[PDB]
Amino acid sequence: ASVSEGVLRKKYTKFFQENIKTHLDLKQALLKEEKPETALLAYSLVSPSGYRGEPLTERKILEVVSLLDEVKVDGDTYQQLKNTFDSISKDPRMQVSLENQYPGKGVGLLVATGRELHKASVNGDAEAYHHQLEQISQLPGRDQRLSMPMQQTLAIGHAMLSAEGAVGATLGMATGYGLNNEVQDQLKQGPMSGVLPRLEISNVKGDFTFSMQEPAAVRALMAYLGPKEDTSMSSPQAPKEAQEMEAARLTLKQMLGSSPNEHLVPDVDSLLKLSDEDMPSQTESTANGAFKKLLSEDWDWLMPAVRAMDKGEAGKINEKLTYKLPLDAANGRVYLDKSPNLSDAQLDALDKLGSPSQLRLMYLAEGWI
Amino acid sequence: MTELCPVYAPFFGAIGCASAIIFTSLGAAYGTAKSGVGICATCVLRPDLLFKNIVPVIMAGIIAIYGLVVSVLVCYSLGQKQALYTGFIQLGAGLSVGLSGLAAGFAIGIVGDAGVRGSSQQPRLFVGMILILIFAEVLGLYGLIVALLLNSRATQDVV
Amino acid sequence: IGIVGDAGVRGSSQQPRLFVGMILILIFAEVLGLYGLIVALLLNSRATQDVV
Amino acid sequence: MTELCPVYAPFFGAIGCASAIIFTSLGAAYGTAKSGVGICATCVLRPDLLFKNIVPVIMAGIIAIYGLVVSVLVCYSLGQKQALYTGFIQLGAGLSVGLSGLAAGFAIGIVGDAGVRGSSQQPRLFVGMILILIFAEVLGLYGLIVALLLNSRATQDVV
Numbered sequence: 014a015s016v017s018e019g020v021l022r023k024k025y026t027k028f029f030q031e032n033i034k035t036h037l038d039l040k041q042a043l044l045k046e047e048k049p050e051t052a053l054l055a056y057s058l059v060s061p062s063g064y065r066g067e068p069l070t071e072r073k074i075l076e077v078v079s080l081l082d083e084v085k086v087d088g089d090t091y092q093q094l095k096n097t098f099d100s101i102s103k104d105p106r107m108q109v110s111l112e113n114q115y116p117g118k119g120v121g122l123l124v125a126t127g128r129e130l131h132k133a134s135v136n137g138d139a140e141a142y143h144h145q146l147e148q149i150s151q152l153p154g155r156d157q158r159l160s161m162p163m164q165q166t167l168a169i170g171h172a173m174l175s176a177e178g179a180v181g182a183t184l185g186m187a188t189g190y191g192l193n194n195e196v197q198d199q200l201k202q203g204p205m206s207g208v209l210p211r212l213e214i215s216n217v218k219g220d221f222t223f224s225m226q227e228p229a230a231v232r233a234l235m236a237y238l239g240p241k242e243d244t245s246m247s248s249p250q251a252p253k254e255a256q257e258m259e260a261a262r263l264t265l266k267q268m269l270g271s272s273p274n275e276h277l278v279p280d281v282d283s284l285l286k287l288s289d290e291d292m293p294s295q296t297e298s299t300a301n302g303a304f305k306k307l308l309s310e311d312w313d314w315l316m317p318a319v320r321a322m323d324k325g326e327a328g329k330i331n332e333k334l335t336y337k338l339p340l341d342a343a344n345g346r347v348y349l350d351k352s353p354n355l356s357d358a359q360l361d362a363l364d365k366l367g368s369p370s371q372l373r374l375m376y377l378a379e380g381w382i
Numbered sequence: 383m384t385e386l387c388p389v390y391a392p393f394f395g396a397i398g399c400a401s402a403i404i405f406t407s408l409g410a411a412y413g414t415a416k417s418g419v420g421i422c423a424t425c426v427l428r429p430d431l432l433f434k435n436i437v438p439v440i441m442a443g444i445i446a447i448y449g450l451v452v453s454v455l456v457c458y459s460l461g462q463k464q465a466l467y468t469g470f471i472q473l474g475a476g477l478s479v480g481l482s483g484l485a486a487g488f489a490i491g492i493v494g495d496a497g498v499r500g501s502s503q504q505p506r507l508f509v510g511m512i513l514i515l516i517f518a519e520v521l522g523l524y525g526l527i528v529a530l531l532l533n534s535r536a537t538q539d540v541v
Numbered sequence: 542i543g544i545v546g547d548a549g550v551r552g553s554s555q556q557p558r559l560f561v562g563m564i565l566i567l568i569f570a571e572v573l574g575l576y577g578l579i580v581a582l583l584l585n586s587r588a589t590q591d592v593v
Numbered sequence: 594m595t596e597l598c599p600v601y602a603p604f605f606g607a608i609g610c611a612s613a614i615i616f617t618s619l620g621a622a623y624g625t626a627k628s629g630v631g632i633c634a635t636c637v638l639r640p641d642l643l644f645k646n647i648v649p650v651i652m653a654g655i656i657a658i659y660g661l662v663v664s665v666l667v668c669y670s671l672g673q674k675q676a677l678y679t680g681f682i683q684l685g686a687g688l689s690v691g692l693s694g695l696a697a698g699f700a701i702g703i704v705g706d707a708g709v710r711g712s713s714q715q716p717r718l719f720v721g722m723i724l725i726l727i728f729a730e731v732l733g734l735y736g737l738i739v740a741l742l743l744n745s746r747a748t749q750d751v752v
Contacts, residue, residue: 199561418545504638511633517653524660528614
């Protein structure tokens with residue numbers, strides 16, 4: 014019971030009824046009730062850079078995200094999120110995370126069609142990987158507050174890239190805008206994702222502000238939460254500014270479910286591999302191969318294997334994921350069984366990992382292992 | 383004009399110019415329709431992997447582009463006062479690429495339908511399906527090669 | 542267009558994301574008529590060209 | 594245009610060149626479609642027998658190369674002033690490999706889907722599948738031998 018959401022825009026219909034198209038006196042129309050300790054907190058999502066150089070001073074999404082943050086039931090979890098985020102936006106390790114995921118801030122028809130269909134299929138598998146990853150955090154023992162909107166952002170971006178690749182291949186094959194806008198607004202319906210704080214950045218270059226409902230900032234956040242803490246930055250012998258940022262980094266990394274001594278470095282490169290200090294511990298690479306074999310053979314074998322693995326039952330995986338399907342052969346239907354043929358050397362390694370950290374399962378679904 | 387080149391020779395160059403795009407379009411239309419009934423029936427309880435499943439429709443489109451290639455090259459060698467030899471070669475080339483495209487389109491449709499159906503249970507079947515759909519795609523290319531070799535020799539050393 | 546339009550209409554009630562995937566299939570059924578139309582218009586430009 | 598070399602004589606060789614690649618493509622198309630249904634229904638259960646089960650599609654794809662190597666050899670013996678005897682020989686060389694490949698492709702498809710559905714329950718049936726598919730494969734090779742023996746006599750002692 015970590016988080017709950019709603020999608021009916023008629024309960025708090027006063028702040029969205031008229032033409033409230035200005036951040037000026039938007040907080041002045043925000044009181045409107047007995048809201049005193051729950052009115053200025055919802056404005057704090059758009060308070061730093063929501064007027065100071067803001068285009069249009071509002072939009073349809075930027076104001077609807079503020080009144081879907083009903084916090085009247087309890088205001089402790091999102092208060093800890095507002096204290097944890099933006100206390101993390103001080104170190105240069107977060108600054109370089111927002112630079113690798115950002116810019117500076119005939120037969121050729123067959124080749125181009127092959128590029129576009131590869132884009133479609135690769136960005137289409139990962140959406141399914143994330144749809145079977147938001148039912149893993151439905152299990153008891155997980156969280157649903159930081160995990161649920163973080164991996165509902167990535168599936169939307171992968172669905173958009175898949176539709177973009179298919180529209181590109183179709184438009185290129187039938188020859189050698191209104192279609193990409195028709196798939197963009199369609200994914201804006203359904204459920205409603207919970208909010209995360211805004212992560213404003215003020216460095217020597219300027220006052221930047223990212224969104225965390227865009228997949229680039231989400232994809233840049235989990236790369237920051239990867240590495241383990243070193244011999245510095247947590248000891249009480251250089252206590253300069255580290256107990257406010259490294260404690261916040263560790264409480265986010267634990268809120269995902271990762272231990273403080275897990276490394277999890279991204280591996281997508283054209284360079285040489287992870288050398289030896291960022292290279293895994295030979296009971297993790299075997300486990301990662303077991304997870305990749307579970308993903309590659311069925312669309313429903315990751316969540317029950319994680320459910321069994323949290324109970325310490327990770328040797329019983331071969332006989333709990335087996336199920337029977339029919340085969341109409343030349344001698345009648347036979348009802349063979351599909352089962353994940355895990356070897357023993359990767360069935361005991363899943364005993365080494367007690368519970369899969371959600372951060373590991375999100376590098377698994379994004380392709381960084 | 384008598385001992386060679388009669389007045390009814392371009393008939394065989396007209397039908398053979400029309401035979402290519404007609405039968406390649408029948409093969410492409412069958413492949414597209416069969417594959418697109420497999421899609422939109424297996425992608426209704428699973429809206430993702432809709433856009434990766436459009437691989438067989440690309441293949442049927444390529445089967446149509448083959449017959450569009452041959453029908454333009456046969457059209458530019460038509461003309462009044464041509465030989466019977468040129469007309470017979472043009473008819474043979476058109477029929478070759480057209481009926482090879484018809485067979486390849488039937489194969490692409492029937493295989494890609496079952497592959498798109500069964501790939502929503504086993505994700506390793508998709509890579510298998512494409513590997514069969516290339517073998518149905520090269521059947522149209524063989525007729526395209528025969529048509530290009532015939533049309534290369536329709537007017538060599540022809541008086 | 543008749544066979545794949547019907548199935549996409551009948552599937553587009555219970556799955557609203559399938560409407561965009563149908564139009565990409567109806568475009569490939571549409572460009573067969575364009576190929577026939579192009580060969581027909583390209584023949585017709587030679588009908589009275591050098592005819593005596 | 595003599596009596597032994599008319600002008601309608603390239604008609605028989607031209608539709609003998611087309612009939613070779615047409616009827617081997619229909620045989621390879623049935624042998625690919627009928628077999629590829631049973632591969633896509635079986636690698637759902639056993640995804641690691643996929644490259645093992647691909648072998649009837651490769652066997653069906655060899656039949657179209659027989660028709661291709663008959664069609665490119667008939668095409669290089671076509672001429673404007675050829676004899677009727679050459680056109681009869683080129684018809685025979687087309688139709689033999691075409692209909693032999695059609696029958697071989699029917700056999701390979703019908704054997705291959707039952708073989709890949711049965712070999713995944715008994716792994717000691719995969720060698721019997723290959724043993725039956727070799728007997729179904731050589732029925733196209735007999736027509737290839739006949740088509741190469743006819744084409745060798747098309748312009749031996751011909752005036």
